Each structure stands twice: as C-alpha cells, then as structure tokens.
Design an enzyme around this catalytic site. Structure first.
Site, PDB file in Angstrom:
ATOM      1  N   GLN A  19       1.892  32.220 -36.493  1.00  0.00           N
ATOM      2  CA  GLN A  19       1.339  33.089 -37.549  1.00  0.00           C
ATOM      3  C   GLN A  19       1.538  32.547 -38.973  1.00  0.00           C
ATOM      4  O   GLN A  19       0.802  32.905 -39.903  1.00  0.00           O
ATOM      5  CB  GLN A  19       1.867  34.522 -37.451  1.00  0.00           C
ATOM      6  CG  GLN A  19       3.318  34.690 -37.682  1.00  0.00           C
ATOM      7  CD  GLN A  19       3.767  36.119 -37.360  1.00  0.00           C
ATOM      8  OE1 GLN A  19       3.806  36.536 -36.198  1.00  0.00           O
ATOM      9  NE2 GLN A  19       4.091  36.867 -38.397  1.00  0.00           N
ATOM     10  N   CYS A  25       1.601  39.466 -36.785  1.00  0.00           N
ATOM     11  CA  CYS A  25       2.200  39.609 -35.448  1.00  0.00           C
ATOM     12  C   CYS A  25       1.474  40.694 -34.639  1.00  0.00           C
ATOM     13  O   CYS A  25       1.229  40.542 -33.423  1.00  0.00           O
ATOM     14  CB  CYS A  25       3.680  39.952 -35.549  1.00  0.00           C
ATOM     15  SG  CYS A  25       4.007  41.398 -36.625  1.00  0.00           S
ATOM     16  N   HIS A 164       7.962  44.507 -35.828  1.00  0.00           N
ATOM     17  CA  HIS A 164       7.408  43.216 -35.429  1.00  0.00           C
ATOM     18  C   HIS A 164       6.669  43.377 -34.096  1.00  0.00           C
ATOM     19  O   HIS A 164       7.270  43.837 -33.133  1.00  0.00           O
ATOM     20  CB  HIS A 164       8.558  42.221 -35.311  1.00  0.00           C
ATOM     21  CG  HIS A 164       8.134  40.841 -34.928  1.00  0.00           C
ATOM     22  ND1 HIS A 164       7.278  40.081 -35.698  1.00  0.00           N
ATOM     23  CD2 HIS A 164       8.443  40.084 -33.847  1.00  0.00           C
ATOM     24  CE1 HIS A 164       7.085  38.913 -35.110  1.00  0.00           C
ATOM     25  NE2 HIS A 164       7.776  38.891 -33.985  1.00  0.00           N
ATOM     26  N   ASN A 184       6.158  35.698 -28.395  1.00  0.00           N
ATOM     27  CA  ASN A 184       6.141  35.866 -29.855  1.00  0.00           C
ATOM     28  C   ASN A 184       4.979  35.018 -30.421  1.00  0.00           C
ATOM     29  O   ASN A 184       4.304  34.320 -29.664  1.00  0.00           O
ATOM     30  CB  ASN A 184       7.517  35.450 -30.421  1.00  0.00           C
ATOM     31  CG  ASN A 184       7.789  35.966 -31.834  1.00  0.00           C
ATOM     32  OD1 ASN A 184       7.059  36.806 -32.364  1.00  0.00           O
ATOM     33  ND2 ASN A 184       8.854  35.431 -32.456  1.00  0.00           N
TER      34      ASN A 184
HETATM   35  C1  O64 Z   1       4.764  40.989 -38.152  1.00  0.00           C
HETATM   36  O1  O64 Z   1       3.987  39.784 -38.264  1.00  0.00           O
HETATM   37  C2  O64 Z   1       4.312  42.006 -39.205  1.00  0.00           C
HETATM   38  C3  O64 Z   1       4.992  41.692 -40.538  1.00  0.00           C
HETATM   39  C4  O64 Z   1       4.503  42.594 -41.651  1.00  0.00           C
HETATM   40  N1  O64 Z   1       4.784  43.335 -38.806  1.00  0.00           N
HETATM   41  C5  O64 Z   1       3.966  44.351 -38.483  1.00  0.00           C
HETATM   42  O2  O64 Z   1       2.754  44.248 -38.508  1.00  0.00           O
HETATM   43  C6  O64 Z   1       4.511  45.701 -38.108  1.00  0.00           C
HETATM   44  C7  O64 Z   1       5.175  46.446 -39.079  1.00  0.00           C
HETATM   45  C8  O64 Z   1       5.670  47.709 -38.767  1.00  0.00           C
HETATM   46  C9  O64 Z   1       5.497  48.227 -37.484  1.00  0.00           C
HETATM   47  C10 O64 Z   1       4.826  47.483 -36.511  1.00  0.00           C
HETATM   48  C11 O64 Z   1       4.615  48.024 -35.118  1.00  0.00           C
HETATM   49  F1  O64 Z   1       5.154  49.220 -34.994  1.00  0.00           F
HETATM   50  F2  O64 Z   1       3.320  48.141 -34.871  1.00  0.00           F
HETATM   51  F3  O64 Z   1       5.145  47.209 -34.231  1.00  0.00           F
HETATM   52  C12 O64 Z   1       4.330  46.227 -36.836  1.00  0.00           C
HETATM   53 CL1  O64 Z   1       3.471  45.280 -35.582  1.00  0.00          CL
END
Ligand code: O64
Length: 217
Positions: A19, A25, A164, A184
């Site tokens: 990424q 993610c 994440h 991952n």
């Molecule tokens: C990981 O690449 C990213 C970084 C901002 N994280 C998310 O998109 C993310 C943030 C909060 C909650 C979630 C959840 F709940 F969907 F897993 C995610 Cl994926």
C-alpha cells in the site's frame, strides 16, 4: 469444522500487495475477499483494483481514500456500481485520484455482503472454513505489529478498537498455539512474506473478530 484451513492451498489468494504511504488497507482487504469469491465462482484468480475503491468508493460510502475507509461500504459500492475493474486495468498508485472506473474493464461483481456478529471467533472460524477469506479490522496501533517477523502474534496492550483492514485467509495452530492466518497489504517483506499469524481464541485479540465481513459475487 477442520482444525486448520489455508485458502492459499485452494488457489483463492492473489499476491501480496504494497500500500505504501496511502492508508488503503481497507480497499486491499475488500478486494482480497472478493478475489476469492471470483475464483470460486468463475475459476479465475485475478487481482482486483484497490485503486478503483480508493478513487470511487469515496464520500457517498463514508470513505476517505488514503485516509481510511470501510470494507463493508466498499462492497456496497461494487454492488451499486455493478462492478469493479481489474487491478491490471486500474493499477495501484498509492494516492487519492478522481474516479476512473470504466465498465469495459470490469473483472468482478458483488451481489451482497454479510457482516458477522461482534466478537464471535467461532462464527468467524465457520465462515473461513465454509465461505472463504473474510475481511476484518484489527488493532494494529502497536509497535509489535510493525516489528512482527514470525510465529503467533500476541500483544498484551492490544484492544478491540480496530484501525487496520486485513484479510483472514485461514486458521490453524503452531504447536497448539491457535492462530488466524492474515494477509496484510504492507508488501512481501512484512512478517511472514506478507502474512501475520495472529492469536486466535484469546478473547478477540486485537479485535480480529470485532468487524468481520465477506462478499458474494
Ligand atoms: C489502513 O491502511 C487504514 C489507515 C488509515 N485504516 C483504515 O482504513 C481503517 C481505519 C479505521 C477502521 C477501519 C476498519 F474498521 F474498517 F477496519 C479501517 Cl480498515
């Protein structure tokens, strides 16, 4: 249920993606789940476009591109949109861009998704065994996650507050220590060549069973 499962053995998991500096993610987790379903339905293993999600599953879906998003609302985008493009046609750029979806490069569809009940690792086990890889959130906000190299990951400071998006592609045990096999999107040099084995049946460790979901084609 089987004692162990590994969807990589079944030809349903694509190469590990990288990424980079973009928080996509959630998009990688979503496409990984759908890739498995596409394989089961059509017999083809094809990387789907995470970028398509970053660029197109945006404000309407409560997502923020490289600043984060939700696998579930990504699935709903693909349903509403009547498609998602191949990674080959719509490759990953690790930045927010204007939506460039074109149905002429559609590689998959989605008809529905299912959100598993909160915290139930037994239900998650059943889904991994019987349905396919499952998109999950984990608490990855601890140095030990970044530093992880091998074995079964356990972090005593982990919480059920997830941040994440990753993909559960199987489960098993390492000399009796139970784990979830997680794909991952931090490239092929993170952990076990892009994978991390996370503690299973240890009280919803790192929130792995907090918010699981899977799509159907
Ligand atoms: C990981 O690449 C990213 C970084 C901002 N994280 C998310 O998109 C993310 C943030 C909060 C909650 C979630 C959840 F709940 F969907 F897993 C995610 Cl994926």
């Amino acid at each position: 249920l089987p004692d162990s499962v590994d969807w990589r053995e079944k030809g349903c998991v694509t190469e590990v993606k990288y990424q980079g500096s973009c928080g996509a993610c959630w998009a990688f987790s979503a496409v990984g789940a759908l890739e498995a379903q596409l394989k089961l339905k059509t017999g083809k293993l094809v990387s789907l476009s995470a970028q398509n999600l970053v660029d197109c599953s945006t404000e309407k879906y409560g997502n923020k591109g490289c600043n984060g998003g939700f696998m579930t609302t990504a699935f709903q985008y693909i349903i509403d949109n009547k498609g998602i493009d191949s990674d080959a046609s719509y490759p990953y750029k690790a930045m927010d861009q204007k939506c460039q979806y074109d149905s002429k490069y559609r590689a998959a569809t989605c008809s529905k998704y299912t959100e598993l009940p909160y915290g139930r690792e037994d239900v998650l086990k059943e889904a991994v065994a019987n349905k396919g890889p499952v998109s999950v959130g984990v608490d990855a906000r601890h140095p030990s996650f970044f530093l992880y190299r091998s074995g079964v990951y356990y972090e005593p400071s982990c919480t059920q507050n997830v941040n994440h998006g990753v993909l559960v592609v199987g489960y098993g045990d390492l000399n009796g220590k139970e784990y979830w096999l997680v794909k991952n999107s931090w490239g092929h040099n993170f952990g076990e060549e892009g994978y991390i084995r996370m503690a299973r049946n240890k009280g919803n460790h790192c929130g792995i069973a907090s918010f699981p979901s899977y799509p159907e084609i």
